[PDB]
């Protein structure tokens, strides 16, 4: 399949070179796999889903999404026109309020209850996690996130945005999930991205175009932005058969775009997701 006019970041997760606008995949599309996204919610009822996403579970009085990042990271993940996986389903877990903001208790509940709700689900390809979120370094967040992935999901987590190393910082240190980098349009380091050896893989993250509250549309920029490429194209590849929960940010990493990033400091992966697609 070939979606011409995409974003720049669809478009650069199917090609081995940056510039180009047509994002090509295979039309499984992720069909079969789900992705939770632990965020702010997601605005359900935006066209763009398809009907292919709903609310969970809320740790707030409501389930709407009053800021938008929980929909335009979604919309990365599995919208029809900004989304990596266009067929998968996608499950809203609002662990942030309204102004972006949570506990790290409540965000350690969320995973949690992602890792048991998941046998509630039908998701004969695999599941997913994407984490665009965290703060400073926590032992007890790091856990968490390891529980998680253990218990078989796919679990992406964003670098942090500190343009600095992301040792610091959770569940972005925690060595057993996938840390995301954020990359531009013109295959540098996002200015604002964090770095260092914890990190496994690079996705497009600066000036991305995704879903967002009231059924629009809006350009936004962060680490938060690559991770549901990552984690969409996990959805992906899982749905492919080529690899599972356990293996798939390894994989991703085995199969990604090398050495094409500059401004990438010593001892960082020079990783871009790539989805290798043959026609």
């Given at each position: 399949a070939a979606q011409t006019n995409a974003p720049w970041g669809l478009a650069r997760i199917s090609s081995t070179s940056p510039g180009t606008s047509t994002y090509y995949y295979d039309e499984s599309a992720g069909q079969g796999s789900c992705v939770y996204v632990?965020?702010?919610?997601?605005?359900?009822?935006?066209?763009?889903?398809e009907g292919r996403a709903q609310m969970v579970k809320t740790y707030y009085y409501s389930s709407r999404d009053g800021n938008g990042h929980g929909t335009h990271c979604a919309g990365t993940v599995g919208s029809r026109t900004y989304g990596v996986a266009k067929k998968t389903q996608l499950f809203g877990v609002k662990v942030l309020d309204d102004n972006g903001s949570g506990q790290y208790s409540t965000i350690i509940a969320g995973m949690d209850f992602v890792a048991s709700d998941k046998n509630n689900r039908n998701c004969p390809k695999g599941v997913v996690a994407s984490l665009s979120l965290g703060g400073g370094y926590s032992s007890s967040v790091n856990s968490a996130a390891a529980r998680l992935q253990s218990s078989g999901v796919m679990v992406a987590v964003a670098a942090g945005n500190n343009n600095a190393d992301a040792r610091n910082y959770s569940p972005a240190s925690e060595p057993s999930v996938c840390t995301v980098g954020a990359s531009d349009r013109y295959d540098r380091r996002s200015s604002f991205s964090n770095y260092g050896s914890v990190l496994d893989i690079f996705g497009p993250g600066t000036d991305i175009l995704s879903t967002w509250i009231g059924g629009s549309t809006r350009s936004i920029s962060g680490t938060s932005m690559a991770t549901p490429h990552v984690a969409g194209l996990a959805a992906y590849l899982m749905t492919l058969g080529k690899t599972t929960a356990a293996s798939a940010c390894r994989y991703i990493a085995d199969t990604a775009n090398k050495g094409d990033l500059s401004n990438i400091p010593f001892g960082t992966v020079n990783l871009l997701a790539y989805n290798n697609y043959q026609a």
């Amino acid at each position: 399949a070939a979606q011409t006019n995409a974003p720049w970041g669809l478009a650069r997760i199917s090609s081995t070179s940056p510039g180009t606008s047509t994002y090509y995949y295979d039309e499984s599309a992720g069909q079969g796999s789900c992705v939770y996204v632990i965020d702010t919610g997601i605005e359900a009822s935006h066209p763009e889903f398809e009907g292919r996403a709903q609310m969970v579970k809320t740790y707030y009085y409501s389930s709407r999404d009053g800021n938008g990042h929980g929909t335009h990271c979604a919309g990365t993940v599995g919208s029809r026109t900004y989304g990596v996986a266009k067929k998968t389903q996608l499950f809203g877990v609002k662990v942030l309020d309204d102004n972006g903001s949570g506990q790290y208790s409540t965000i350690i509940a969320g995973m949690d209850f992602v890792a048991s709700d998941k046998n509630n689900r039908n998701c004969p390809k695999g599941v997913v996690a994407s984490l665009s979120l965290g703060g400073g370094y926590s032992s007890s967040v790091n856990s968490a996130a390891a529980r998680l992935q253990s218990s078989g999901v796919m679990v992406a987590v964003a670098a942090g945005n500190n343009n600095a190393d992301a040792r610091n910082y959770s569940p972005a240190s925690e060595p057993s999930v996938c840390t995301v980098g954020a990359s531009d349009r013109y295959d540098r380091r996002s200015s604002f991205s964090n770095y260092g050896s914890v990190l496994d893989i690079f996705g497009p993250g600066t000036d991305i175009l995704s879903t967002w509250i009231g059924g629009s549309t809006r350009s936004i920029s962060g680490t938060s932005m690559a991770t549901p490429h990552v984690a969409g194209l996990a959805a992906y590849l899982m749905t492919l058969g080529k690899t599972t929960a356990a293996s798939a940010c390894r994989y991703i990493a085995d199969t990604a775009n090398k050495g094409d990033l500059s401004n990438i400091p010593f001892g960082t992966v020079n990783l871009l997701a790539y989805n290798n697609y043959q026609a």
